[PDB]
Amino acid sequence: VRLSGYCWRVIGYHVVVWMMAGIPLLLFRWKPLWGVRLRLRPLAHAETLVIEIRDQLFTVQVQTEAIRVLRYYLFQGQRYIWIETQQAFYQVSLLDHGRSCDDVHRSRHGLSLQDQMVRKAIYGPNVISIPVKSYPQLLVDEALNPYYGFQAFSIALWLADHYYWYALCIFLISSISICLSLYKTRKQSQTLRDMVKLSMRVCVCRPGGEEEWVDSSELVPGDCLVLPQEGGLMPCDAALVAGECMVNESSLTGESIPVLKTALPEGLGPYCAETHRRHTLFCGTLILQARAYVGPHVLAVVTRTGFCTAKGGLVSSILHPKHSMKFVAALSVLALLGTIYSIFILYRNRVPLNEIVIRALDLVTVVVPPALPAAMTVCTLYAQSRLRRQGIFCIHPLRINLGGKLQLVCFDKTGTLTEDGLDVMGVVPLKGQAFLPLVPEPRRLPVGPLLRALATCHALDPMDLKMVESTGWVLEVLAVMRPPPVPVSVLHRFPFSSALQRMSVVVAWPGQPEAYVKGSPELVAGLCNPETVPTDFAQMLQSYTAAGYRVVALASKPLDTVEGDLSLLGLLVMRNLLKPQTTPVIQALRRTRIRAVMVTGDNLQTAVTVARGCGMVAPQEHLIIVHATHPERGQPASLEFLPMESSRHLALSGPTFGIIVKHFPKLLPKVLVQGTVFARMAPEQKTELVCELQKLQYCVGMCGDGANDCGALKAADVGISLSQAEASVVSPFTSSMASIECVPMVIREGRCSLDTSFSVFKYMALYSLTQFISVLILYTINTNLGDLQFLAIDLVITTTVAVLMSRTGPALVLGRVRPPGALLSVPVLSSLLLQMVLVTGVQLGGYFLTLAQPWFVPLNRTVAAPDNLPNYENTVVFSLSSFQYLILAAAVSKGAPFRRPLYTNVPFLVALALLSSVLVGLVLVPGLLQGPLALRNITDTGFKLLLLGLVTLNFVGAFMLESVLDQCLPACLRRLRPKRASKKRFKQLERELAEQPWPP
Ligand SMILES: CCCCCCCC(=O)OC[C@H](COP(=O)(O)O[C@@H]1[C@H](O)[C@H](OP(=O)(O)O)[C@H](O)[C@H](OP(=O)(O)O)[C@H]1O)OC(=O)CCCCCCC
Ligand SMILES: CC(C)CCC[C@@H](C)[C@H]1CC[C@H]2[C@@H]3CC=C4C[C@@H](OC(=O)CCC(=O)O)CC[C@]4(C)[C@H]3CC[C@]12C
Ligand SMILES: CC(C)CCC[C@@H](C)[C@H]1CC[C@H]2[C@@H]3CC=C4C[C@@H](OC(=O)CCC(=O)O)CC[C@]4(C)[C@H]3CC[C@]12C
């Protein structure tokens, strides 16, 4: 957390940095401080560049501006300013901490223009600027990968060794990949910048009157907005100081229900907005309307701006957040050994120094394939095209591999698991003091008062629209309804009073005038006569509200004068229905041991009811709600466990999650291990939960749809967006169709990308290593393959097999078993080692067998490697190795259970057959392609048949070796060291809870 400030030397550093030619790696290595120490020229008060460790290192420039002196710097989107009173930097977001509500009210009048200028210079513009970088900036930042440097070095060596064609191919691949990467990264950054941009004309009063109009960018905390009478997005965070408003906070909570925000209660005591959330207007939330009732207009004082806002925090978290495939020790040591052996034998076989250097360096490129990442990404490109053919669109194909090893999925409730809106579940008529049975659809009912009220009473508001749609009375005196009977026209109406949640309408028909009142249950029931209102109004209503539903009371009277003498006609119940495809998908995931979690901004009751309905909680499984009371400061916070109607499941609330994180760090892992519902979660709390679960060694994905769950999608390993706007920006994946079915197929696709990649990896390793071995053999006798032979091994065979072995698709089903995750696993290493023992055996045996012939004559070693050809050793070794490459490519690839069977991809098998056909033609057919490829045309037929038999033996041996390894290695692994006790943190916690269940 500590920091320091570093006050000619740049010229020396630039020369030294450029002269070293490798110090950039050392600077980019563990020790970068020296690189900054020399350049920065190492007080806090007097500095021009600051460095801070987060205990980690980060460097920032101490920006400055003139107002009468200011020194400030940005970090993670948060501004800090230097203060001379304490001679130190302070975060601007805490400049006015714990303002009293009366102090806020004292700013009822706006902010003076001079004070506006100085305060803008302090806080800065109200915009959230995304620092989009230029193309060279992106190149130096996100394309400094050392593999690209190695590829460039290998290319340069190959042009220095006359191997032009493959070097050109690798250069084209790397350049195109780099260009596409930079382009898409820039496009993503630009789109994010567009998404967060906001522009409005906002009114601000002044103490000199004449309330001016300014841009959203000019607002600073302390002036007050005159909220528009109609509505619109909120430019920043603010506190209502005069009037009431109805807001649509779907951006924070994910629900579109109107929310009432009243004025701030004037008085002493600090204003925090954690407890005054009901009196604060947040940035981005849409204002449905603003009614003053006092004074000329609604006034709301600004409190936060820019990154300080909730949207600011979310975007800041978004901006500021296999792996074992890059093992280093074995390859480095092997390359070193092979190199020193090459120099030893080469100096034993006298050849020029430059040739020795070129050969020894080229052996390194033989060892490490420069085409490996392209081979890795071919299958991900296949998977991306496959997904895009069925809706899901991806931006980072290499991310698809993470889908294979996914084991935990979080789901938003509204819009994702349930419809993005409420729907009529049914109406509950009551004749006397007893409710009649719930009616599924209100259309089939008599023409009594209840149906008339169901058809007429409305403000015509998605809710009334759904009501009118369900009742079916088509519109055609403020209206005339047609029953699909009698025509009921609306004779008079009244506005829906925001304070008293009533809406009354008086109607009449050709057949007395009658009033119908729609409102909240308890208040309207209180308006009604207790004679008709039943005894059990509290329980018939708690049965629905506790079950996540929202009830509305209908009252009536045959005609304040209107909503007086009333009798209840029924109750209309609304419900957020599960989408038709969520239960099958959820149960499909559950039967494969992929844990599903709900992370909602809704209340807990709706969350738990939906969780039970969709199958996340089986009917026989327990469920417990953990509640954490806030610390009173006399006694600490303490947890209380509440069971419900009755694998254990825990339903955690929103504030209680933060309480457990802050005051119970030790028990948080236990709760996270077996927690399934997280309700009333803030947009940052979703990201926090995702981060903690990832800290528990999980591979978490999320399928959010709304704006609130955008940071979580960015933080998740595999994020999926069901909305084509406001959330596709951050999500790696986006599905045009909006339901949970996108989740499983992606997982299936991911497994292919995680499985095929493994096979591809193995082949590449083998391709390199066997080639290395062959080179060594020839290097042992002052000979080399040949340029055309090298191209015919590197260009055609590798590219053909690598691309054609990636065509295979998934197996149409989700098994309970994940594919292997770590490339350095025992099975991978054992398979590679055994295959190479076989390959080395065949090559050395062939070499030692071809020497015992009457017709063999050794090459003369007085001549260089390429001028020794055509040559017996070269042709024999090339003939064996060329078949070996195809054998390895065929044996390495797999089929079920993660991919389709290996015999489906007819193109791959046909390619193998054709390549083997041309190779056997080269071995047998004399002098047809042996001009280009310097082969010596073995004349003895028996030896050629023996070579064919030997390579056939290698073929069958390799396939049988792979089969027996796959079908008998798990048994050996289990029988050795049976105390497995898997090292993953969540598995360890699961076992610990299994022995001793934490909730007693
Ligand atoms: C020289 C370098 C060699 C590297 C060796 C590789 C490392 C090594 O040993 O794996 C541990 C193995 C098993 O390791 P291995 O099976 O290869 O992989 C492990 C488990 O499979 C674990 O399984 P779960 O219970 O399902 O988690 C989990 O999946 C992790 O793999 P993941 O990437 O798929 O998540 C690993 O923790 O444990 C023994 O089976 C005893 C025999 C070990 C013999 C040790 C001799 C060295
Ligand atoms: C693996 C090895 C061979 C690395 C090869 C890297 C190349 C792919 C780099 C080297 C120089 C780069 C170019 C350097 C400069 C520009 C100028 C740039 O145009 C501008 O000058 C404006 C850029 C801006 O304002 O952001 C467009 C990209 C381009 C062609 C770059 C594209 C990518 C190039 C060709
Ligand atoms: C000459 C050297 C440098 C080798 C270059 C090999 C390329 C010619 C390969 C590499 C990536 C391949 C592509 C990888 C993925 C696909 C997706 C694939 O899409 C599907 O067939 C599935 C979608 C569907 O059918 O639903 C079509 C072929 C294509 C474009 C491949 C065509 C051939 C490409 C361009």
Ligand SMILES: CC(C)CCC[C@@H](C)[C@H]1CC[C@H]2[C@@H]3CC=C4C[C@@H](OC(=O)CCC(=O)O)CC[C@]4(C)[C@H]3CC[C@]12C
């Ligand atoms: C000097 C001599 C060695 C000439 C070598 C010419 C190469 C540039 C040719 C030979 C074989 C060709 C490959 C043969 C087959 C394919 C399969 C082809 O497959 C697909 O297009 C996708 C198939 C699918 O998606 O189902 C992609 C190009 C590729 C790798 C070809 C790219 C160009 C290659 C490497």
Ligand SMILES: CCCCCCCCCCCCO[C@@H]1O[C@H](CO)[C@@H](O[C@H]2O[C@H](CO)[C@@H](O)[C@H](O)[C@H]2O)[C@H](O)[C@H]1O
């Ligand atoms: C041996 C056979 C050789 C096969 C040759 C033919 C295949 C050539 C494919 C080259 C890869 C092109 O594909 C491009 O690769 C780069 C990195 O590799 C990916 O880049 C990836 O990482 C970068 C960051 O490093 C991310 O910003 C980007 O989102 C992500 O996808 C591009 O998203 C992918 O589109």
Ligand SMILES: CC(C)CCC[C@@H](C)[C@H]1CC[C@H]2[C@@H]3CC=C4C[C@@H](O)CC[C@]4(C)[C@H]3CC[C@]12C
């Ligand atoms: C044994 C002797 C003769 C070999 C000497 C060759 C050296 C210089 C080669 C081998 C591998 C090469 C490096 C591989 C990785 C990196 C990191 C990259 O970000 C910059 C280039 C750089 C630094 C390469 C260039 C130089 C390099 C270090």
Ligand SMILES: CC(C)CCC[C@@H](C)[C@H]1CC[C@H]2[C@@H]3CC=C4C[C@@H](O)CC[C@]4(C)[C@H]3CC[C@]12C
């Ligand atoms: C001169 C000496 C080093 C012999 C030559 C061996 C070189 C080529 C070896 C030694 C260590 C190796 C590097 C070790 C680490 C990584 C990280 C990985 O994510 C990309 C490949 C990369 C960058 C390797 C490429 C090959 C490498 C540079």
Ligand SMILES: CC(C)CCC[C@@H](C)[C@H]1CC[C@H]2[C@@H]3CC=C4C[C@@H](O)CC[C@]4(C)[C@H]3CC[C@]12C
């Ligand atoms: C002719 C010799 C030098 C070989 C050059 C091959 C060229 C044509 C190769 C090199 C890299 C290749 C591209 C690499 C990746 C992609 C992205 C994929 O989503 C569609 C195909 C596409 C766009 C490829 C088209 C063909 C391509 C441009």
Ligand SMILES: CC(C)CCC[C@@H](C)[C@H]1CC[C@H]2[C@@H]3CC=C4C[C@@H](O)CC[C@]4(C)[C@H]3CC[C@]12C
């Ligand atoms: C061209 C001449 C030499 C024939 C060579 C064909 C070889 C390379 C290929 C073509 C068809 C392939 C087989 C196709 C079907 C199956 C069943 C399945 O479990 C995968 C392996 C297996 C058993 C394959 C093994 C390798 C195979 C035999």
Ligand SMILES: *[C@@H]1O[C@H](CO)[C@@H](O)[C@H](O)[C@H]1NC(C)=O
């Ligand atoms: C190998 O070297 C020479 C030329 O370098 C070549 O002509 C001849 O075949 C071989 N030398 C002998 C003595 O056979």
Ligand SMILES: CCCCCCCCCCCCCC
């Ligand atoms: C199976 C791979 C066969 C490779 C064929 C090589 C053909 C080279 C063309 C001829 C170039 C040299 C003629 C002077």
Ligand SMILES: [NH3+]CCC[NH2+]CCCC[NH2+]CCC[NH3+]
């Ligand atoms: N797989 C990368 C190895 C490439 N080896 C190519 C060696 C080319 C030899 N050229 C010798 C030039 C003789 N005039």
Ligand SMILES: CCCCCCCCCCCC
């Ligand atoms: C683009 C792939 C290379 C094809 C052209 C080169 C053919 C080999 C020429 C060998 C000359 C000795």
Ligand SMILES: CCCCCCCCCC
């Ligand atoms: C951290 C990535 C770079 C590691 C390179 C290892 C040293 C190579 C020889 C200098």
Ligand SMILES: CCCCCCCCCC
């Ligand atoms: C010839 C190099 C360009 C190949 C096409 C690049 C990507 C096209 C995306 C539609």
Ligand SMILES: CCCCCCCCCC
């Ligand atoms: C320099 C060749 C550029 C090819 C990629 C341009 C983008 C294609 C549309 C995504």
Ligand SMILES: CCCCCCCCCC
């Ligand atoms: C070299 C031309 C042949 C490439 C294969 C064509 C596609 C067949 C599988 C659909």
Ligand SMILES: CCCCCCCCCC
């Ligand atoms: C040359 C390798 C490709 C051959 C493909 C044959 C067509 C298969 C689809 C029926």
Ligand SMILES: CCCCCCCCCC
């Ligand atoms: C001794 C004559 C050669 C014997 C060859 C036996 C192997 C035939 C399988 C191709």
